[PDB]
Design brief:
part of a larger assembly, 3 chains, alpha+beta, five-stranded antiparallel beta sheet, 15 strands, binds a molecule of 2 linked components (NAG-NAG), binds 2-acetamido-2-deoxy-beta-D-glucopyranose, Spike glycoprotein (chain B)
Chain lengths: ~425, ~170, ~200
């Protein structure tokens, strides 16, 4: 019987609060299919390959072939539409400066490699390494892998040099550590936490990126969702081709043997059976392809939404841009898909404290302007909610509302007045 | 059959007279007189697309033979999507106007003719990044943009018996 | 711009036309007109020619209905997106990037369109950016000062604190900033005087 997880009772009480004293910078990988192979099937060639006797019999079925061709063409066009929507989200082609003074953060393994013919990143090369004549043709995608790599490079450069300003207007430059301070504000952490732990945070980010590289270079089946799409398309085409060996009640499945051995009056009877069977096979293939293409389009719409809301911005949606408090995201092109490296903030080392909703000083109830009241056992401080930074409770930390006869759990403590010593002195 | 016969390196056993493919089509044969193995391939085939500006604009068109080399078939240009005939390849790069494939797009431009080119992805822009420089907007604009979303399609009911067996 | 709607219309029309044209196919019969078969042949021979038409037309109807199901699923996805956009752009103000247009979403207005909706997204776009020197913090008395809301900027000689999305420089005071620690940690910290009202 499977285990649903490790049981864990939360140490809940009416005056106990756990507050993180540290953090970790997580970098998680999310892989989304964006497009699939653009296949085309010449319906007449597949059913009646180079046979006029069979073609004139297939003309009796109306326009069944032309609408199968129309459906496949629509699928092939929407594949390019999917790729364009996901990756053509940057109006200008941004490139990072030759100076990499990004506050100690190292993006060398996600930035392009000029040495290689295709200016892919190291991780993009890992991704592209990890994913592997009967009327059937494959149409090349409109955007080459070099163009998708250029789009991802432009998105990465815009994010790294300007933050989220390039997705709203003109890309406005800002030092990267100040951008990370903006992200820390956006997740509810005061920005002095970023500045005072800048080297630690940068080291954690670099280590997480290195772990991404190691995992990709080690675990072969990392891009299983892309390989699943590739295998599905391969299986569909293999079934379509192998259906050409079915007799469907004819003497032979080879149209040329039937035409060589039989006269037209008897040959037509067998050719009709072959036409019926192969037409059914083509229709089944095209319907399955339409359903699969709808699934791929849904995946690509999700990928474009994630590009916009995680790479071009900082998302407040929970678990939309990775597990944890989203800081930023980096796109990496993958074969027929995209990879998002979600940098998130994970509180790390929490400690128990005694807490109160409010505090009484002079018959007035005080509440934190920002943060929560905590006690280390004897003294009361006001800390920010996602990081333990205790501070003396003053009249700038808090605000008053009414008296102390209403709040449930209110504790007696003194609220320091910064103006009092100045006035007394 | 119909196709192209080429000398093959397949190592037929003495008792084998032909080989078959996955679709059960004869892929190779043994010549009955000079006992050599021949590979049989389909001659050459592929779709034919017509690249046109609006007939309002011009009646001049280019033709793409999809997935065919520029030898089986003015201006002849070998693309990865196939052979393009009637389009003037240009070393400039513009926005994609009519997509051909593999990064190649076609447009009608200036004496006017259809040209093919490698499409541009946008204008290069190196952001003036440094560790103590910040760009801050001093003004703003209010932009109203239109997004159009389909909501419904036409509700149709088909009388099966009247469509198939009308009266 | 209205193509997204017209295409849908076209698609529907196309499908119906195809269906109608499938009534002009013999499917192996001597005629695609049922009265012609009935008016010329006896039932024993009429049934043979009618079965082919029945098979072909049933296949055509099944094709039509399956295509309609797939297209209806696509339209359902589009309409769900349109309803989410109505909720989050017309009935609110979205922080989701590029969900209610390109820029910082201010509001949206709905307009009915044939078989669809149009959203007029009013967004805020920064226009005329200037370069300034910037610091992550400021040192006054061995204490590091950080902006409560905004960024420290310098026009070359003097240091102000401005809001981040619009240049509105202001004097750096103890009300614009907050203190946390000393000046031995913050990388890039600069010396300036913090005013005390
Ligand atoms: C917060 O966690 C980090 C690790 O994520 C701690 O940094 C480690 O500190 C130890 C001892 O000083 C070193 O041996 C490690 O090399 C450090 N790791 C890294 C990645 O720098 C940090 O000390 C923790 N802070 C608190 C207050 O607990
Ligand atoms: C960013 O990280 C890469 C590797 O993760 C660093 O490149 C390494 O540099 C050291 C010494 O400079 C070499 O011994 C390694 O062989 C390099 N590895 C690779 C994969 O190139 C790079 O120096 C880092 N950037 C900065 C600014 O420190
Ligand atoms: C709770 O915090 C207060 C304030 O930090 C602690 O009181 C201080 O303890 C340190 C210990 O070295 C002394 O140096 C300070 O002079 C004390 N200040 C005051 C105002 O008392 C207190 O000990 C802490 N309590 C617990 C249980 O950790
Ligand atoms: C918090 O302080 C207030 C006042 O300092 C306390 O209220 C006193 O309660 C006692 C016991 O009932 C009365 O005899 C006093 O008259 C009250 N003082 C006033 C000014 O009303 C209150 O009890 C304290 N709370 C706790 C939990 O100790
Ligand atoms: C940066 O801004 C400060 C304050 O706005 C400028 O100082 C003022 O400059 C004006 C010039 O018209 C003088 O009239 C004021 O008397 C100056 N005030 C002070 C307190 O110096 C400063 O010139 C600006 N520097 C640059 C390079 O633009
Ligand atoms: C900001 O001011 C402080 C002090 O006013 C400067 O620190 C002094 O630096 C000089 C030269 O390095 C030393 O001789 C002094 O002893 C330092 N004084 C103190 C109190 O630390 C600091 O260098 C200034 N920062 C900048 C960027 O000019
Ligand atoms: C808080 O106290 C409870 C007491 O049962 C303990 O189980 C829990 O681990 C404590 N939390 C922390 C973060 O130490
Ligand atoms: C909190 O819970 C304890 C549990 O014994 C109880 O004694 C106390 O009265 C509670 N506090 C409030 C404010 O109800
Ligand atoms: C051809 O297009 C132009 C603009 O693209 C338009 O002004 C003109 O009316 C069009 N011609 C016709 C016959 O509609
Ligand atoms: C077309 O054929 C020639 C020689 O037959 C060959 O050199 C060329 O590479 C072929 N085209 C492509 C695109 O490979
Ligand atoms: C583009 O420039 C190259 C020179 O590098 C030249 O060989 C080539 O002929 C040019 N292309 C055209 C279409 O003129
Ligand atoms: C900011 O500095 C860069 C440095 O080259 C310059 O290109 C840019 O034009 C400057 N910004 C403005 C608004 O002039
Ligand atoms: C910013 O980069 C320059 C490189 O020209 C360097 O000299 C300077 O020390 C850097 N600033 C900080 C705060 O490290």
């Amino acid at each position: 019987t499977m285990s649903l997880g490790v049981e864990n009772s939360v140490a809940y009480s009416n005056n106990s609060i756990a507050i993180p004293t540290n953090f970790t910078i997580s970098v998680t990988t999310e892989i989304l299919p964006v497009s699939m192979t653009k296949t085309s099937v010449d319906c007449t060639m597949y059913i009646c390959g180079d046979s006029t006797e069979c073609s004139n019999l297939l003309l009796q079925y109306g326009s069944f072939c032309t609408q199968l061709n129309r459906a496949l063409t629509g699928i092939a066009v929407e594949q390019d539409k999917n790729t364009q929507e996901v990756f053509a989200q940057v109006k200008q082609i941004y490139k990072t400066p030759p100076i990499k003074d990004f506050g100690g953060f190292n993006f060398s393994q996600i930035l392009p490699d000029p040495s290689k013919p295709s200016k892919r990143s190291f991780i993009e090369d890992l991704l592209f390494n990890k994913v592997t004549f009967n009327g059937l043709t494959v149409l090349p995608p409109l955007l080459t892998d070099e163009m998708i790599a250029q789009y991802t490079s432009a998105l990465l450069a815009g994010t790294i040099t300007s933050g989220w300003t390039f997705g709203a207007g003109a890309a406005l430059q800002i030092p990267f550590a100040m951008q990370m301070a903006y992200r820390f504000n956006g997740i509810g952490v005061t920005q002095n936490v970023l500045y005072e732990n800048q080297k630690l945070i940068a080291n954690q980010f670099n280590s997480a990126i290195g772990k991404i590289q190691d995992s990709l270079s080690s675990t072969a089946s990392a891009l299983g969702k892309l390989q699943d799409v590739v295998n599905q398309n391969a299986q569909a085409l293999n079934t379509l081709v192998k259906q050409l060996s079915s007799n469907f009640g004819a003497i032979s499945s080879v149209l040329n043997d039937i035409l060589s051995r039989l006269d037209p009056p008897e040959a037509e009877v067998q050719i009709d059976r072959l036409i019926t069977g192969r037409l059914q096979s083509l229709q089944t293939y095209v319907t399955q392809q339409l359903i699969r293409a709808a699934e791929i389009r849904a995946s690509a719409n999700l990928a474009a939404t994630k590009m916009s809301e995680c790479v071009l911005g900082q998302s407040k949606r929970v678990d939309f841009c990775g597990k944890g408090y989203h800081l930023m995201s980096f796109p990496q092109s993958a074969p027929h898909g995209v990879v998002f490296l979600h940098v998130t903030y994970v509180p790390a080392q929490e400690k128990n404290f005694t807490t109160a909703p409010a505090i009484c000083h002079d018959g007035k109830a005080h509440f934190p302007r920002e943060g929560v009241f905590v006690s280390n056992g004897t003294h009361w401080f006001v800390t920010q909610r996602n990081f333990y930074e205790p501070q003396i409770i003053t009249t700038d930390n808090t605000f008053v509302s009414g008296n102390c006869d209403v709040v449930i759990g209110i504790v007696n403590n003194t609220v320091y007045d910064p103006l009092q010593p100045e006035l007394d002195s | 059959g119909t196709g192209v016969l080429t000398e093959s390196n397949k190592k037929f056993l003495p008792f084998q007279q032909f080989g078959r493919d996955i679709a059960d089509t004869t892929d190779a044969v043994r010549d009955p007189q000079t006992l050599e193995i021949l590979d049989i391939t389909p001659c050459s085939f592929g779709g034919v697309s017509v690249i046109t500006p609006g007939t309002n604009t011009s009646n001049q068109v280019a033709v793409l033979y999809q997935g065919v080399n520029c030898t089986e078939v003015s201006n002849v240009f070998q693309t990865r999507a196939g052979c393009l005939i009637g389009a003037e390849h240009v070393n400039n790069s513009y926005e994609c106007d009519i997509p051909i494939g593999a990064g190649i797009c076609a447009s009608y431009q200036t004496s006017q003719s259809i040209i093919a080119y490698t499409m541009s992805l946008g204008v290069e822009n190196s952001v003036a990044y440094s560790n103590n420089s910040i760009a801050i907007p001093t003004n703003f604009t209010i932009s109203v943009t239109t997004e159009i979303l389909p909501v419904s399609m036409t509700k149709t009911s088909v009388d099966c018996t009247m469509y198939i067996c009308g009266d």
